[PDB]
Every structure is written in C-alpha cells, then in structure tokens.
UniProtKB/Swiss-Prot annotation, chain B:
Gene: rpsI
Ranges that cross the membrane: none
Domain of life the protein comes from: Bacteria
One function term, GO molecular function aspect: structural constituent of ribosome
Any one of the GO BP annotations: translation
Protein name, UniProt field: Small ribosomal subunit protein uS9
Lineage of source species: Bacteria, Bacillati, Actinomycetota, Actinomycetes, Mycobacteriales
Disulphide bridges: none
Record keywords, A-Z: Ribonucleoprotein, Ribosomal protein
CC terms in the record's Gene Ontology section: cytoplasm; small ribosomal subunit
Family classification: Belongs to the universal ribosomal protein uS9 family.
UniProt keyword annotation of Ribosomal protein present: yes
Curated annotation (Swiss-Prot), chain C:
Domain of life: Bacteria
Similarity comment text for this entry: Belongs to the universal ribosomal protein uS3 family.
Keyword annotations: Ribonucleoprotein, Ribosomal protein, RNA-binding, rRNA-binding
Gene name for this UniProt entry: rpsC
Note: Binds 2-aminothiazole antibiotics, which are antitubercular agents.
Transmembrane segments: none
Protein name as it appears in the record: Small ribosomal subunit protein uS3
Molecular function terms from GO: mRNA binding; rRNA binding; structural constituent of ribosome
Subunit description: Part of the 30S ribosomal subunit. Forms a tight complex with proteins S10 and S14.
GO biological process, one term: translation
Any one cellular-component term (Gene Ontology): cytosolic small ribosomal subunit
Residue span, KH type-2 domain: 37-105
Function: Binds the lower part of the 30S subunit head. Binds mRNA in the 70S ribosome, positioning it for translation.
Organism, as annotated: Mycolicibacterium smegmatis (strain ATCC 700084 / mc(2)155) (Mycobacterium smegmatis)
Swiss-Prot record, chain F:
Protein name in UniProt: Small ribosomal subunit protein uS14A
Species of the source: Mycolicibacterium smegmatis (strain ATCC 700084 / mc(2)155)
Pfam families: Ribosomal_S14
Complex formation: Part of the 30S ribosomal subunit. Contacts proteins S3 and S10.
Keywords of this entry: Ribonucleoprotein, Ribosomal protein, RNA-binding, rRNA-binding
HAMAP family in UniProt: Ribosomal_uS14_1 (MF_00537)
GO CC term (a single one): small ribosomal subunit
UniProtKB/Swiss-Prot annotation, chain G:
Subunit-level organization: Part of the 30S ribosomal subunit.
Name recorded for this polypeptide: Small ribosomal subunit protein uS10
Source species taxonomy: Bacteria, Bacillati, Actinomycetota, Actinomycetes, Mycobacteriales
InterPro entries linked to this entry: Ribosomal_uS10 (IPR001848), Ribosomal_uS10_CS (IPR018268), Ribosomal_uS10_dom (IPR027486), Ribosomal_uS10_dom_sf (IPR036838)
CC per GO annotation: ribonucleoprotein complex; ribosome
GO function term, MF aspect, one: structural constituent of ribosome
Length: 82, 126, 208, 153, 126, 100, 98
RNA sequence: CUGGGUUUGACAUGCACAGGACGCCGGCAGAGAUGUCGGUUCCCUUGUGGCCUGUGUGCAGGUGGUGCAUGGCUGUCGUCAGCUCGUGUCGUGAGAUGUUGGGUUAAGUCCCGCAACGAGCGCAACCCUUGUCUCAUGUUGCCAGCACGUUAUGGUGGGGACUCGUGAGAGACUGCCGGGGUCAACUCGGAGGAAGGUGGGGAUGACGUCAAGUCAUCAUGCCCCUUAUGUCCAGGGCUUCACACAUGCUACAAUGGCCGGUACAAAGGGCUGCGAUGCCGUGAGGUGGAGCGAAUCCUUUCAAAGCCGGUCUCAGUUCGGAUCGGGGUCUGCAACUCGACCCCGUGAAGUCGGAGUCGCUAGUAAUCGCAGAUCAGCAACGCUGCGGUGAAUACGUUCCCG
C-alpha cells in the first residue's frame, strides 16, 4: 500500500466534485474516471459511477469500504465459466 | 634467505623457510588454528615426509586466494620448491612423487547455452 | 549465418579502427554525431566512389578524413562543394569540423570501390556475369592483388527466383588471421528489388 | 571407451588408517562433495566397530568385504539375436567396488537413527556374516548358478 | 486416445475432423500412446498450390512418430496425415510378428549382421 | 521503429529538462523530511498538477538512430543489433571480439 | 611539489609510445622521473545475441580494454611545464595532469 | 479493446497567398488529448531569409499483406570431413577418373601405389585465455630486512626482496633415446621438463540442405489504407482459467533443522551514481553524508558450503513452506486489476515419485555462494559470467540413436 507519509491519494477532479457535492447536503450520482482514488470519509453517502472499461457501474459508499479504492468495486474482467 | 611461491587454482602461497623447529606460521596462525582438517595437514607435510626432514625447518607462509584446499595444495608446492632450493640433490625423490608439478586444473569457463561448463539444458523430444 | 565480417575478425590484428578518439562521459553523443556524419556523407555523395570515411576528434576540433576515387567531383574549384560540406557539418553541432579530402592510389584494388562499380553496372542493364568477370580481371591485373572473390545474390536478371553466384581467382584464405582480406559490401538498386554484392580481395599478409 | 580403456584415478592412502580401502569407502559414502562429513562418518563408524569388538577396525572391515565380495555375476548377453542372463566372472576391482557399494547402500537403509551407527552395525554384521549385503551376495551367486546353462557364450 | 490440436488462423471444423480421424489410430499402435499432438497451419501466399500444412506427433511408449503433409484444404490434409501416420506406425510395430522375418534363421544357410558366428577349432580342419 | 514514437521520446526529454530539473525535484525535497509541513503545503497535489511527461519515469532508452526500444546498451546508446554491426566494422574505438 | 601524469588509452603500443616520448621530453628539460609505472588494465565485457530474432543460445562477447600508465616527476621547473603543455600526442591517448 | 479528439496530419521537404510573431509563462473547463482567457514579444534589410498560422498543393504516414518476390542477419546437419575446378584420359551420353586400393591419423592428415597431373574452399597453423620461467617494473599494488606506530590494521616513514599488476621474451618442436614399423607415414615406452605428443578451454562453421526463421531491428518489389489500417489521449488488456504440455526453483529431512562462535575467493559495477562512520527502528528501512570517475572510496574490512559448541530425536515433526488475515517500508504522478521487500499470525500438498525419459568422462557431474546486463522499481527461481568444496565409472561395440 501507499506509504503513510504521503497520505491517501485522491484525484483532484472528484475531490472538488465531492466538495461542491456535500456543501449543499444533496448527493446525486457522480460520474468518475479515476479508479485509483482512495475512499475518504467524505464519500460516506455519495454514489459514484466508476468506470469499468466499457461503462460506469454505480458504487454507493458506506463506512465499511472506507480506505479502499474505487477500483475494487468495478470488476473489470467478466467470467461465467466453461 | 630463500623464498618460493606455490599456486593451485587461484590460490597463491608465499613461503619463507628458516632452519628452526617444526613451527608452522601461516599468517600468524598455527597449523592447527589454520587447516583444521587432517587430510590437509598430511597433504601439507607429505614433501617433508618423503624427504624425511620433518621438524627441522621453521616455516612462514603468506596465504591469499582460493579456498582451504587450494591453499593447502599451493602451500605443498611451495614447500616442495623451497626444499628443492635448499638441498638440490633430493630432486629425484620429490619429482617422482609429483610434488614439483604445478597442477593446471582450473575452473572451466561457463559457456552460453549451457547451464554450467558442461551441463546442458534438459531437452524434451515429445 | 556462415561467415563473420572479415574486418571485424582482424580488427585488433591487421585492420584498424575507422574512428579514433577517446571519451568516457561523452562516448554516447560522440557515437551519435559520428553515425550522423557517416550517414550524411553517405547520402550526400554517391557519384564519386566513397571508399572509407575516418573520424578523429580532439575536444572542440573534429577531423574527418574520407577516401574517394574521384576527389575532383566532391571538391569545389571555388570551394562550393567544400563550402556546402563545411556548412552542413557545422550544422551537425560538430563545433570546429575540418576535412582532408583524399584519393586512393589503386581504385581497382579497393574492395568497396569494386563492389560499388559492379553494383552500378548491375543496376542499369548489365548481366551479372559480365560485371563479375570484368571486375575480377581488372582486379587481378593489379600488382599487389593475390586473389579476389566476387559474389552477389538476389533476383539476378529480374527473375522471380533468388540466386547466389560467385567466382574466385587465386587465393582467398578467409580463415587465416594474418592475411589481410579487404571486404566490400554494397547493394544494387534494381527495378525488381535489391541486389547485394560482396567482394573479397586478398593481397598478401602483414606480419607485425 | 570406443577407442580403448581409460586410465584409473590413483586415490591416496588414508592418513589416520594408512589403507587404500578406507579411502575408497569414504569416496563411496561421499555426497555432494562434502568430503569432511564423509570422513567424519567413516571414522566414527570404524571407531564404533573398534569399541564394540575390541580390535583393529581395518581387519574386521576387510573381513566384512571378503564376506560380501562377489565372484560370479550375471550380465545380459545378445548372441545371435537373442538375449539371456549369462553368468560372468568378476574381476577383483569390480568385486571390491560392488561390495563397498552394497555396504554403503544397505547401511543407508538401516534403522539406527544415524548414518554412523547404521554403517558400524552393517560392517559388524557383514563381518559376522548376517548383514543384508551378505544376503545380496547370496542371491547374486544363486542367480549366477541357476543360469549356468548359458555359461558357454 | 486424447489429442490436442493447435491450429492457427482460419480453419473452421478442421480441429474436430483432425481429432476424430487421428483418435482412430490408437488401436493401430501396438504400445500405449502417451501423447498425441496435431498442428494445422495455412500458407498466407495464394500462390501456393497446397497451402494447408498438417503435422502430427505421437509418443508411442517413448518412441516418437511424426509426419507432415500438404493439401488444398483441411480435410485432404488431415486424411493424408492419417495415411502417413498409419504407414509410420506399421513400420514401427517392433512386436514379434514385425521382427520374426529379420531374426537369423537356419544354421549355416544365410548370413545377417547378428547371425551367430561359426565356432572354430584351434587346429586347421585339414 | 515508428517516426512518431522516436520523436515523442525526444519531446519527453526536453520536457524533462524543462520541468524535472527544479519543479519536480523541490517538491520531492519537501516531502522527504517528516518535519517539513507537507500536508497543508500540498506539495503532493502541486506536483500532481505538473504534466506526467515531466517525470523521468516515463522515459525510454531507445537506440540513438534505429529507435529500437529493447536490447539497449547504456555505454553506446545503441541496440544490440547495431552494436554488433558497427563493432564488426571497427567503428567503436577499443572494441573487439572476446576470447578467454 | 610534484604533479601526477596519468595516461589512459585503448591501445597498448600507443600509450607506451606516449609514455616513452613524455619521459624523453621531461628528461630533456632536466627533471627527475619515476618511470612508466604500470597499472591494472580495466576490462568492460558485454554479451549480445547474434541473431535479430530468437536464437538466444548463440551469443557473442565483446570487451573494451583500457591501459593505464602513471608518470610522476619532481623539481617542477617552468621549462618542463612549458614543454609539457607543448606536446602533441595521438588522439587515442589522453593525459590527466594533476 | 472501449470511449473521447484530429486531419498536409504526431513527424519531414518543396511550390504559393497573407504576416509579425512563433514561442512560452499563469487562470479556468475537461480524465486527458485539447479548448479558451490574461502577460511578453523576432532578428535580416527592402529583397526578403528563419516561425508558424490557416488556406492549400505535391506529400508525409502504416508494428497493413505476401520471409513461396527479396537483401541483410541467423539456426541446423556439423566443427562432421567433406565439396569442387583446370588440363589430360575413358564413354554415343548422362557421366567416370583424379577423390579409388594398402597403411595411418582427430582430419580428403600423411605415406606407398595408381590414367592421371595439379589447384581451390574445407582440416591443421597463424589470434585470445590458461599452466612454467627470464628481463623490465614499483602506485592506489607487495612488505622480507629497517624505524615510527596504538590498538585498528602496511596504519605510517621507508624498501624490489617475495607476490601482484602489464610490457618484451624464452619455453614442446616426436627435439632426444629404445622398440615396432616398406626404413615410409605412423605408433608404443623412457629421459628431461611446469607442461609430451593437435597440454586445457575459447574465437573460427567448406559447397550446400531444410522455399528453416525473421516484411515486427533494418531495408525492400508488388498489393492495400489515407477523413482511415495514419495520429493524440484516458481507462482497460497483454497477468483472464475445467484442463494439457515444457523448462526451472523449493522440498519431502538427522550426510538434517535451529541458535552462538569462527576461517578462507574470484570476477565485476559506480556522477546527478556507489554511497561509509554515526544516530533512530526489531526489520525492511529512515536521517545524515565521509570518501570516491576510483589497484586508493563504496560494494562492508567482502561470501556460503566449511570447522567448533549447544539443542532437536525420526513425528507430516523445531521438516516443508504454499495459501490466507492483520500491520508496514521503498520506488514511482499512481502498487485495485498488477511490484518487491519487512514484521506478527496462519501452517496446504509433500514419506523420494508408473510407463517412459534427460545431462555428464575430471577440477567434470553434484553442491555453495558472489557479480553483471536490462532496470525509477521489480515478476530474476531466468540469462551471461566468477570463484569455494569436489566424486563414481568406462569390461567393450551385440543392441538403441545420429
């Protein structure tokens, strides 16, 4: 994982997006493209449309998944079996 | 004084022989602190045994390169050369024993395409 | 892959390096500017037979010596060719770049010139047997040449099948290290493709 | 070996026992080039045998060798496009080699919790003629005798 | 018998046909087959009169049997490969029925390489 | 290889010398000492705003003429294919075939 | 005060020629020398694959060998110095003056 | 691959019209490409040159196709000893002879014969390294004899003595002796020598074969795309897994595991790199920077197997380490897909492996560690080298392969 001195990494785009999103206490779906951004306690209620490679899958954040990345919740490869 | 050298597969031995007792001085350590292996000691003292001049030469030696076995072999060649320098007329006895011959056996160079000098990669026909 | 390049086989024994300088930090850029110089001289001059190009460097000044069979063609009577090459060698960031144009004593005894002539004849209309025979006879007519082998391969005569042909005269001991074999390779531009011509010339041996 | 026999390696006499055969034994028990460990194992086994019997270890070791040394051994021979088990006389050097190899292996499959004790026990039982190497010599002699019909070629 | 087919490019149905045709050769082999591989390739150049190339490899109890054929389509290549493999397996048999005519016979009539040499007395017959 | 990619490698190098020389190095000096106040400084965030091409981590040692991206040698800046051909022609001073 | 004269060249005969010519000129100017003390040869080895494609098992080895000679003088009279900076040498050999 | 842009284009050079800016430096929007806004603005010299703008126009650009159109490079039979030519002779001719026969050799190597006489490419030699010695040679390398040393040692003044480093040279040539030999090649043994019979190992690969491999190092004929198969960007993929094959590493243990002490290498690398002493962590590591372009400093003064001592006592174990949970370090804009390493915990299969099959003849196999290239980091157990310890066996060509 990322070293502690650098702190968590979040892209500026969705950062400013969630800051303007929570300033008026209304949480609409946010369409995003940085799967590498960590979950911050400022996302607890916001619903992210994180990219997959083809489309965007809704991700509704909770307290449990804080500290992970938006990428773990958009599974890329699809496998159904042989 | 007299000084000769012995070389055995990357081990170099400088020997300084004086006519004292059978004290073995190898870089300030004795024959027991050094070379703690009886076979190595016998290999060391074989020229003295065949020349029967055991315990009448104080030996000072400089050791560098190689491992214990190579150092022992180079040291034995060194005492053989020193003895041939001290008393020439014993050359038959040492030479027929082979102690006057430098051993030209070195690590074979590793070759490309082979894992080792001669070991070849496993080949599957199927 | 049958035969190694004869020049590289005897690089430290008989033949000599074509570039002479020393660099420790600036080896890479020295090589870059050297290959730029060589390619620029290659494209710029093609009428006169360019046999060899030497490069010498010492700090700011750069000394380039080249051998041609027709020095007058590459040199300007008022220096026009000299002016052009000097200016476009300054453009190569060589700082002070200085040239010695030279001329080879025996054009037919030099492998590169022989290959260039054979390929030039091959390009327009000439049958390859004529070219090889003429080159071989002209080379053996020279006094110091002890043996020449000429070989070019490709779609010879515009045929659909690639072929390899070669003739030899005298002695060509490629395996002998002290023997000096002058090696020349140059590619013939034909309407049906590319024909590559190799020439080996053996002139005695040098014992150092 | 297509162009003739190859020369043999003249290995040296042992320093602390002065016999050729103990050196042959240490080279037989040698693994991965760890010669020091091999000599330690062999010397420990010889000293254990000396302690148990009370006499020289070399003499009892030689007795074990003669007890396990084979004389008739069987090799497959193809004569006239057919293969059979033909009993063949064994040269002294090969008999010694086979005896030592049998001793070392059958000691390696003993159950005395340590290689030194296994080897000492195997040499002692071969000296008294009860070891598994002695048995193996019995079976190889039995097989050589049972195929005596093919000894003519 | 199980066969794995490693085709390339475009050869629809070639894998199944090759599998079914080759798997029928197990009974012809007189020893168990440990592995069996088939490869189908096509020549890119339209100038080739027989573009499709089929290769096979069978491990007949350690004995390697292989063949290679050319055809104008997958079916013809597979069939010719089957024919060649059958011929090779016939020539490999090595069981007794396949080597009964080569074993030396009679006592003095006929000679072969492995024929039993005649026994000769020490003295000339006279 | 491809002319566009040969060129783009050079463009990265001129970008690197322009930016990584001081801009993308002072921020690293800020982040090194835990004593230095990095968190409010946003030296991480400021250095994110810089172009990716500033970072030398995006560079690629290609053959100086050929453009070959693999089998490169740092001593000569040349591909393994080109080094073999020019050494054989006696173009690199003090280079020859080996034996030992 | 003495200064170190350091030679590094890829060619043995060239650096030996320069060393002897340099001791000749400094002895002409009347200076005490130590002689061309030999130094260990530096060997840089590279291994390359012959073929452009595949065929990894076939490799070709190259080296570059650098020879070093050490020249040390004494009594640095200005005439020897002025001679030292007025020497022409083959481009292959470099000189380090310290 | 999905999506977002772009077209004389991401990049060249030439014909034109208009210029004084191109170009940067910051703001905003955007995932970015990019777009927009704010600030700075060419030197020639009167004809225009350098820059770009657009408008264009030739054109660029293709890791697009065909290695059965090719060059170049390479593998392979095979480092096997063979492949040919000139003249002559025989035959209607394809062709033969020479190149076959006897002997001999690693060898078409050589000798004797011979309708053949010679020659060329091959063999061998010339090149490198290694094993012995002589002369030269003393720093950053040695230190035997001398002095200063303080524990820290060639550390220091000094010295060529011995190594060592690198230059030159000598030395193996059946040179000599004895015996077989056609008195010929050649062969067996002995002396001398460091080395004896191409000393050991390299580099070197004949004519050709297999339309062998490579239009993806590069070049290239022909065909095809050209508002795209060119070109820019973000994300993803090349890491997907019911299986099959192949090359390796680690094991299944006592010839061993763990703990403590302790001895010996070679080779190589290092400038925006190696990085020491010290301090802080348990440990990856962090801070810090001595000295080094390096026979000097750093890679520790360099190793591990080894030796000594203690413990474990034959068990799925103090074996084995996979898998998994938690916690961290470093590189990098960024370790989710998808890095390495560290700590604690977890503790799978595995009891020496069927048919079958592989490598190796001596410093070899086996085993142990070290280094380098690529490289910000690493999937490295891979590859290329280096040294340490170091065996067994070869009766002999009937069988298998070439």
């Amino acid at each position: 994982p990322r070293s502690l001195k650098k702190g968590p990494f979040v892209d500026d785009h969705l950062l400013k997006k969630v800051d303007v999103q929570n300033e008026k206490n209304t949480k609409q779906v946010i369409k995003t493209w940085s799967r590498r951004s960590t979950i911050i306690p400022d996302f607890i209620g916001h619903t992210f449309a994180v990219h997959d490679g083809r489309k965007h899958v809704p991700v509704f954040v909770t307290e449990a998944m804080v500290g992970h990345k938006l990428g773990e919740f958009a599974p890329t490869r699809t496998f159904k079996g042989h | 004084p007299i000084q000769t050298v012995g070389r055995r597969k990357e081990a170099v031995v400088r020997v300084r022989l004086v006519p004292g007792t059978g004290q073995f001085n190898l870089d300030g350590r004795t024959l027991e602190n050094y070379f703690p292996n009886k076979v190595h000691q016998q290999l060391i003292k074989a020229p003295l045994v065949t020349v029967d001049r055991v315990d009448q030469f104080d030996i000072y030696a400089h050791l560098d390169g190689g491992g214990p076995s190579g150092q022992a072999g180079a040291l034995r060649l060194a005492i053989a050369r020193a003895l041939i320098l001290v008393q020439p007329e014993d050359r038959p006895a040492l030479k027929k024993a082979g102690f006057l011959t430098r051993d030209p056996r070195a690590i074979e160079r590793k070759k490309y395409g082979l894992k080792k000098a001669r070991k070849a990669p496993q080949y599957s026909k199927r | 892959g049958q035969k190694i390049n004869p020049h590289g086989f005897r690089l430290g024994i008989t033949t000599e390096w074509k570039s002479r300088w020393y660099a420790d930090k600036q080896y890479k850029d020295y090589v870059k500017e050297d290959v730029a110089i060589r390619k620029l001289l290659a494209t710029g001059l093609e009428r006169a037979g360019i046999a060899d190009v030497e490069i010498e460097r010492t700090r700011d000044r750069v000394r380039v010596d080249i051998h041609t069979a027709r020095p007058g063609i590459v040199i300007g009577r008022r220096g026009t060719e000299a002016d052009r090459i000097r200016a476009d060698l300054e453009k190569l960031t060589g700082k002070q770049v200085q040239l010695n144009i030279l001329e080879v004593k025996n054009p037919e005894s030099q492998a590169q010139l022989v290959a260039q002539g054979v390929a030039e004849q091959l390009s327009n209309r000439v049958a390859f047997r004529r070219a090889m025979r003429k080159a071989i006879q002209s080379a053996m007519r020279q006094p110091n040449v002890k043996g020449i082998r000429v070989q070019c391969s490709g779609r010879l005569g515009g045929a659909e099948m690639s072929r390899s042909e070669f003739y030899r005269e005298g002695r060509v001991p490629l395996h002998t290290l002290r023997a000096d074999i002058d090696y020349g390779l140059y590619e013939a531009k034909t309407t049906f493709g590319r024909i590559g011509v190799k020439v080996w010339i053996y002139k005695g041996d040098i014992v150092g | 070996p297509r162009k003739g026999p190859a020369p043999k390696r003249p290995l040296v006499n042992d320093p602390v026992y002065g016999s050729q055969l103990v050196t042959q034994l240490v080279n037989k028990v040698l693994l991965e080039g760890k010669k020091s460990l091999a000599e330690r194992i062999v010397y420990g086994a010889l000293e254990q045998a000396r302690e148990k019997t009370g006499t020289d270890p070399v003499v009892t070791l030689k007795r074990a060798l003669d007890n396990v040394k084979p004389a008739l051994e069987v090799r497959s021979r193809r004569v006239g496009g057919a293969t059979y088990q033909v009993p063949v006389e064994v040269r002294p050097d090969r008999s010694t080699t086979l005896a030592l190899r049998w001793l070392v292996n059958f000691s390696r499959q003993r159950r005395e919790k340590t290689m030194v004790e296994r080897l000492a026990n195997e040499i002692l039982d071969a000296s008294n003629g009860l070891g598994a190497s002695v048995k193996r010599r019995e079976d190889t002699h039995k097989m050589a005798e049972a195929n005596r019909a093919f000894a003519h070629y | 018998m199980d066969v794995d087919v490693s085709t390339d490019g475009e050869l629809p149905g070639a894998a199944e046909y090759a599998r079914e045709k080759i798997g029928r050769l197990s009974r012809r082999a007189h020893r168990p087959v440990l592995h069996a591989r088939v490869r189908l390739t096509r020549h890119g150049d339209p100038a080739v009169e027989r573009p499709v190339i089929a290769q096979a490899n069978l491990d007949v109890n350690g004995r390697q049997v292989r063949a290679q054929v050319e055809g104008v389509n997958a079916r013809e290549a597979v069939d010719r490969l089957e024919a060649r493999l059958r011929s090779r397996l016939e020539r490999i048999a090595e069981h007794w029925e396949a080597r009964r005519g080569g074993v030396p016979a009679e006592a003095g009539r006929e000679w072969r390489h492995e024929s039993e040499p005649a026994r000769r007395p020490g003295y000339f017959p006279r | 290889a491809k002319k566009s990619k040969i060129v783009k490698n050079e463009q990265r190098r001129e970008l690197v010398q322009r930016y990584a020389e001081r801009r993308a190095e002072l921020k690293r000096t800020i982040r090194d000492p835990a004593s230095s106040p990095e968190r409010r400084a946003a030296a991480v965030s400021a250095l994110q705003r810089l172009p990716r091409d500033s970072s030398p981590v995006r560079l690629r040692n290609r053959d100086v003429v050929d453009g070959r991206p693999r089998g490169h040698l740092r001593k000569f800046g040349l591909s393994r294919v080109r080094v073999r051909e020019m050494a054989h022609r006696g173009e690199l001073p003090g280079v020859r075939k080996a034996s030992w | 005060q003495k200064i170190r004269i350091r030679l590094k060249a890829y060619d043995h005969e060239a650096i030996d020629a320069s060393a002897r010519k340099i001791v000749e000129t400094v002895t002409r100017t009347g200076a005490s020398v130590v002689g061309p003390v030999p130094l260990p040869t530096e060997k840089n080895v590279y291994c390359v694959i012959r073929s452009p494609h595949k065929y990894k098992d076939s490799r070709e080895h190259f080296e570059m060998r650098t020879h070093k000679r050490l020249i040390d003088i004494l009594d640095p009279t200005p005439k020897t110095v002025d001679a030292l900076m007025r020497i022409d040498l083959p481009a292959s050999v470099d000189v380090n003056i310290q």
